[PDB]
Design a protein around this ligand. Structure first.
Ligand code: NA
Ligand code: NA
Ligand code: NA
Ligand code: NA
Lengths: 958, 961
């Protein structure tokens, strides 16, 4: 019999999806006001009012209260109508959710006092609160908060966010690395601490005891963290040097004052120290490098493996490169809960690598970016043999059962080793359920924070409260943020039975979502859904597909659309459910589609089209949308090949795609403990499926190769005519570049405006072959009258594929054109080598070359490259609605192209790639100029998906 | 007849000193809850409850609600008993005050939605709010918010505070400075934009048109801000280059990627660019330089003038140095409302200097640090000829008149020119009455923000909301902060009649305070109070003192303790009041004291003692205090000589002090519009005066030179005895270093433990002269018994002054000792050359020198300097309760001192300085070693003010009702 007590216990923490808890909130707000009144009365009770009743009933006062009331109601109305409804379980996109009422109430209660934690005398109470919050976080993460033991004493503080926490960690690591060189300078002959240099020793990285003055620069750049952090205490213990003197003397030698590059230059050092970090690291990492004057070039990114974890062998190889080149390493970043997939780097392996490299003389700090993952350490098991008190029974079985579940074994292993990192970022305003702003940084050894200053630690005195706000980036800071986090910690509980219970219910919800992503699509649905984390039987890439399909059907029969109670009573179902989806509650998955004969799409850009449209249906990305009409919210990301390498390749492989392009995926962050109530998740799954099916129909129309109607520009005169197809990427059947010489049978003859031919009988472009013919219709620009015509005697000058698989990824430096026609009557058409691109054609041109070109070359079609048109530098071209063509446009009447002329090295008709990157190495036929005269066609929309309607607009037009 | 309307209008904006407006707040909170419910019901109305009634009445749910209620009441009770009561007008110390209810309500209303302004799709509404707030601030500050005009389009955003806003402004200035070098690299031969290099020109700093590729590195380092910001648009307009291509290509050349120092080395550049900023700038400036890898050494500090304004002539001299040495200047910081004094730098003169140096080829961005001063631009006059609608009358005269007053002319001039700075920092959570966290940064030309990125501006599209959170230091950020500022702006009003009214009332209150600081003390009070901003008749340092006293008496007769109505009806009184105190609401002042014969103290450290104790009485600096017992709150600061130079000198001069030491001053930030009601300001003045008189009594006791009882260590044996006075700085009468040879008449003979003599009849140390005598009592260590003795045949071996004026400011590198006695029986006593210090004496020692020293030299007393005791490195010595003496202590039995020996170049007795800094250049008598044997005395508390009780502890020991 399943108990509802654990879900009921956390249901009281939130206002609720339907504001079910509003009466409790009203009571708590009334208490806040009463207490405020009591406290302001208690401060000098004999003071009379400054705001009298006669003042309060005057017209100006009343006018101000009416303005406040009106502005307030207008803000509340607009917030409800225009914000994302994170409070609803329909939202499961980013790291957003209904926040905990204890946090909101802590912040509100404290803002009436508006304490400023930059200084004790402005925050005598909330400075102590914030210090206690830092130590709560530290202990929860496994650091030591006890004084006078053998372990280092941790310290923690609140910052505006994990971005500033990561910046501070990198700043401390920057200053740490150079401290021993600064101290060596400060103790050089002639300097203020020369008197220590003949006796002051350190342990070098490999453990040898040497005088600081006898260490090589490399040795000084590789002292262990503890070796460096111990130096001020050691100087005091061993020479009775005061912290005041030490700080004063060191001011002129530390990089806070001189910057690291002046110090390096004096020391003859040329290798910039680096930070090592996974290729997919949060933006705050390269940004901190740029801010700190390290430079993002010196944030060296470590490739990831197929599950997006930092590749340990690659980290090994890059640490070896640093050792061999004497490039110091400030810091290695372990991402504990990646932003995009919720994965956990193997910090156990990073720690092993540190031991390995310290034996070779290379040392570095380790930082755990646990901005997202940190709070999941509350799910680590804790010794229960310490509790012996009566426990109120858990015997409720009211409707409203939601179980918690536990961490995956690997996640628990890494979470229990983050306590060995030298510092840890963790965001209460991510998985702590505290509203923004509330980030946090904890140091394993709190003395590290003094590196962020020009100061040395003093002995604290009881008669002077210590300011906790001078050890970071910021200045003024809200003590209210500390009260908020503190209220969350004390009310929810930093234990398995508190936060562990809440996050375990979110994790059960996450796995229930993942079951749907993992089994929704079949062999015959129009769509496929592929989870980023394969189901157990699917992990092996050579698995028996029968076993994979069997496990998917097991999911359909035993998990999907069942109640929590039925599932929890099914041991096998729970064991399987335990293994589905993200390590830490961030499911990634992606859709593909099949045509109507059930053939899977393999084009990465068409899968991207589909997945981006699904995202658009399930998100708000413009002010035009009514967000209350979105029934379900996801996020989305692009796995760039260059950052996700083998991982992005494997995602594409399992989706059934072929190609090197970056792949778009969907992201489903799960923080809600409510979604599985009454199997609401199933409803969401069904909603998702319905929308996917709609978008797949569009995809199928987009990619249908049935015969259809095509458009062609006409070039030439009665002497000889050419047709130039107007390609498009909006239809798979239009993704061809085609130029033909033809005869035109009909009554057309007019010697400004485009002449356009459509085929009247539907046809496939690929069926146009030498000798063919077809009937058509002419349309002189906007003229209402039309002309019937017969296209005969077709000769294919060019027929190339504009399919993804046949295009290039890099634009040409100089713009290439097909150059075709007859002597004295040539024509131009921009070669489409990449999309997005721009169609450029010129029917009437004047060419002059240093060598006359033969009729054979002109008929076969040459390639001319414009030395004065730098195509790549202009890409992508603005959409037609966003730029005006004038005579200054580079492709307009009167413009002159200076060109080199080449023979086309590929056959007339080809469905294979035609790379032209090195066309400049082909034999040059001749060179000269081309002046554009007329019959010019310019279209930057047809070859660019950005001109298409969004899924929001299409859905609104139904 | 004065109107109460303007004060009534702003009284409704705050919960109130006594929470008078709690019923209004209760109503508004009820509305917040009601609307949250209506909103969550409106999103998919057919969704049923997830939290049912049966869940809400279950025992686990009820237990969680009881825990919430219990934690909430505990937090509220503790906040009320343990926080500073900023809500009361009794508080007037730092930039803290009761915050506006519209702001608190905007933040609360929005946190239920918890929007994240890092990305539009997480904040489709509050991103727009934050952009609108940025443009509101920009327009208020005088920037342009209109599109499609000739003026640049400003942009602003909210940051966690002014520290991060200053950091972003300096980061933007750093990347701006190097952009043209990066673009030159990106268009070099072989590079991706080589094709522009033969046609792409810029205007150099002096205005000549040159190809970018033909500029010298110095010329590229001095292009104007607008020249640089125009480059992406120009490349697009002139070569049709796309922003995508430009961004991608430039990533490898910009210092975001390479850092400035690798770029500089590739260009052969050796002068670090600098930031120029006043010597008194907020800590956020040197910290930003340190963060950004510029280094605080390259934040060059500009000295201030006697009113703490950046000295414009000194800035001129420093810019000339930069020009001559080809040191680029990132940025010049004009502080508009200094943190310590509320002063306004003359940015008009800085703009003139910019014109001067641009004509010479030196250019720099200008940043206005208006973190505090910015909101005072709402008090600038505005054209009212645009308003023609009916105005509800201002005819209320109920009790509660508080007038607003206007800016000083100089403040208005500078505030109206900050719109010419390239960027402006301003804090809603300082003078905006918005709770923390809410700082802000505005760019005159919003395109500058793209320097904080690897991006180039794209053309916006309607179907995609633009994220406003990728242009700064931070990541996730609360849309709630933007709602808070937005509500405060809409409700209070960014106009002279809105914020201008509120701040004008605070400024009237500030001047009412300043009147007390300016006239409270007389010729015969035991204390003096000296304002940092002199009264008009006192500005001239050679003014007729009759005129100064006449104006102080005018203030006493016409302003102090009068009602607002009487003062406002007194034109002459208002004209004078207008000129008192700070420029922008931060009064600085400091106290001094007189002895009981009415002689003014001139000792800077005794004035500091007094002002620090007064501060303690009016502040909470420890967790032991009950903050609700403090009746008035001030802040305090130290004007360091090295930073405030002539300004600190002039403060000390006008207090009557003589000396080069740093001076402590008191600081009175005024943000309350309520303090003048019922002349509550007067009550506070009297409270202040009472406490000052209390502390002056302590100062008088501390500095009374009347005869008293003194302590002496006894050195030597029956052969010859010496007395070594145990000096103290806790009493002026103990501030002498004294060594005497004496005869001891009595029944004393004890051969580990200290032998101590006090005089039994009070005496003055300065009257001890050769031949004198006095009765005394011996005390063998821990012995309960005492011994009558007669000290006779006194010979003064050393008598030196330990008064502030006769001590040195820098500690000796090597420790000096007096070395005296007879051959084979010498003694040591650490020379006290600076305080704080440590008393070190050794009665029994063993010396060995390379030359035997004569009995005359030993009797007169030599100076031995210990090569192996580095005195400066150990100072200040920990207090006695904080360290335990062991045999490892450098001054303990068995320690060997390796010393040089010198003759004392000063007379036995002297009340003048005895500098020993360069003792090493005196002729060396001999050298050798001294081994400490016994009779050792060590005391680190007697010569250190840190061992004294605080003013809070003394006051706690005085009984009261
Ligand atoms: Na949408
Ligand atoms: Na192909
Ligand atoms: Na106090
Ligand atoms: Na003297």
């Amino acid at each position: 019999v399943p108990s509802s007590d654990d879900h009921e216990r956390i249901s009281a923490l939130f206002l609720g999806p339907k504001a079910e808890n509003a009466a409790f909130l009203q009571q708590w707000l009334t208490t806040v006001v009463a207490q405020q009144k009591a406290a302001r009365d208690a401060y000098f009770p004999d003071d009379n009012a400054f705001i009298t009743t006669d003042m309060q009933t005057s017209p100006a006062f009343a006018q101000t209260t009416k303005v406040i009331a009106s502005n307030l109601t207008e803000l509340l109305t607009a917030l409800g109508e225009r914000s994302i409804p994170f409070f609803s379980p329909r939202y499961s996109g980013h790291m957003s959710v209904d926040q905990s009422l204890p946090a909101i109430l802590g912040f509100l209660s404290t803002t009436f006092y508006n304490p400023n934690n930059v200084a004790f005398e402005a925050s005598p109470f909330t400075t102590l609160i914030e210090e206690e919050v830092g130590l709560q976080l530290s202990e929860m993460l496994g650091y030591n908060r006890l004084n006078n033991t053998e372990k280092p004493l941790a310290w923690g503080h609140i910052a505006s966010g994990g971005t500033v926490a990561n910046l501070e960690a990198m700043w401390a690591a920057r200053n740490l690395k150079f401290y021993p060189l600064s101290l060596r300078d400060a103790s050089a002959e002639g300097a203020e601490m020369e008197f220590i240099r003949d006796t002051f020793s350190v342990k070098t990285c490999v453990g040898d005891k040497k005088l600081l003055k006898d260490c090589s620069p490399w040795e000084l750049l590789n002292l262990h963290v503890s070796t460096i952090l111990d130096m001020p205490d050691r100087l005091h213990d061993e020479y009775n040097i005061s912290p005041q003197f030490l700080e004063k003397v060191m001011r002129k030698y530390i990089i806070q004052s001189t910057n690291k590059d002046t110090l390096m230059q004096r020391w003859g050092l040329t290798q910039q120290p680096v930070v090592l970090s996974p290729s997919t690291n949060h933006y705050s990492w390269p940004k901190a490098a740029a801010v700190l004057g390290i430079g993002s070039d010196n944030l060296r990114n470590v490739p990831v493996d197929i599950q997006a974890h930092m590749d340990i062998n690659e980290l090994d190889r890059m640490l070896k490169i640093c050792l061999d080149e004497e490039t110091p390493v400030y810091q290695v970043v372990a991402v504990i809960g990646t932003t995009e997939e919720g994965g956990v780097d193997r910090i156990t392996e990073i720690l092993k690598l540190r031991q390995k490299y310290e034996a070779l003389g290379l040392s570095f700090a380790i930082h755990a970016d646990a901005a997202w993952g940190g709070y999941f350490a509350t799910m680590l098991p804790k010794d229960t043999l310490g509790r012996n008190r009566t426990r109120l029974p858990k015997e409720d079985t009211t409707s409203g059962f939601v179980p918690h579940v536990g961490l995956r074994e690997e996640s628990a292993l890494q979470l229990s080793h983050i306590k060995y990192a030298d510092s840890i970022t963790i965001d209460p305003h991510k998985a702590g359920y505290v509203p923004y702003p509330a980030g946090a940084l904890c140091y394993r050894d709190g003395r590290m924070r003094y590196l962020l200053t020009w100061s040395a630690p003093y002995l604290a005195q009881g008669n002077e409260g210590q300011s906790i706000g001078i050890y970071g980036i910021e200045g003024s800071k809200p003590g209210a943020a500390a009260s908020a986090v503190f209220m969350a910690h004390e009310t929810i509980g930093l234990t398995p039975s508190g936060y562990g219970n809440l996050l375990g219910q979110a994790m059960f919800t996450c796995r229930r979502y993942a079951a749907h992503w993992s089994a929704m699509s079949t062999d015959t649905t129009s769509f496929t859904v592929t989870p980023f984390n394969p189901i157990p039987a699917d992990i092996d890439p050579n698995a028996d597909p029968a076993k994979v399909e069997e496990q998917k059907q097991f999911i359909r029969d035993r998990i999907l659309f069942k109640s929590n109670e039925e599932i929890y009573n099914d041991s096998e179902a729970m064991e399987l459910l335990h293994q589905l989806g993200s390590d830490l509650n961030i499911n990634v998955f992606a859709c593909n589609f099949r045509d109507r004969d059930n053939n899977l799409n393999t084009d990465v850009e068409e899968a991207n089209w589909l997945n981006n449209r699904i995202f658009q249906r399930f998100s708000v990305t413009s002010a035009e949308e009514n967000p209350l009409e979105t029934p379900f919210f996801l996020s989305s990301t692009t796995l760039k090949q260059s950052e996700y390498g083998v991982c992005a390749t494997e995602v594409k492989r399992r989706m059934g795609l072929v190609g090197d392009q970056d792949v778009i995926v969907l992201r489903n962050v799960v923080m809600s403990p409510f979604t599985t109530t009454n199997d609401f998740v199933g409803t969401l799954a069904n909603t998702f499926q319905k929308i996917v099916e709609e978008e797949v129909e569009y995809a199928r129309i987009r990619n249908d190769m049935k015969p259809s109607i095509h458009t062609f520009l006409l070039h030439g005169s009665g002497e000889q005519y050419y047709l130039v197809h107007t390609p498009t990427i909006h239809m798979a059947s239009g993704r061809r570049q085609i130029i033909l010489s033809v005869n035109v049978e009909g009554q057309v003859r007019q010697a400004v405006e485009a002449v356009i031919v459509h085929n009247t009988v539907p046809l496939r472009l690929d069926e146009i072959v030498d000798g063919g013919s077809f009937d058509g219709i002419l349309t002189i620009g906007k003229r209402k009258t039309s002309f019937k015509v017969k296209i005969s005697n077709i000769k294919v000058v060019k027929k190339r594929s504009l399919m993804t698989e046949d295009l290039e990824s890099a634009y040409p430096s100089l713009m290439p054109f097909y150059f075709y026609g007859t002597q004295g009557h040539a024509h131009l058409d921009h070669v489409i080598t990449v999309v997005p691109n721009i169609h450029l054609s010129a029917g009437e041109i004047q060419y002059k070359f240093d060598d006359e070109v033969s009729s054979e070359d002109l008929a076969k079609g040459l390639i001319v490259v414009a030395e004065n048109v730098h195509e790549a530098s202009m890409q992508p071209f603005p959409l037609m609605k966003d730029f005006k063509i004038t005579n200054q446009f580079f492709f307009s009447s009167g413009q002159i192209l200076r060109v080199k002329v080449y023979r086309d090295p590929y056959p007339a008709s080809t469905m294979d790639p035609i790379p032209l990157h090195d066309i400049k190495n082909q034999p040059v036929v001749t060179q000269g100029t081309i002046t554009l005269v007329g019959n010019i066609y310019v279209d930057s929309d047809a070859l660019n998906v950005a001109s298409e309607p969004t899924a929001d607009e299409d859905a609104a037009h139904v």
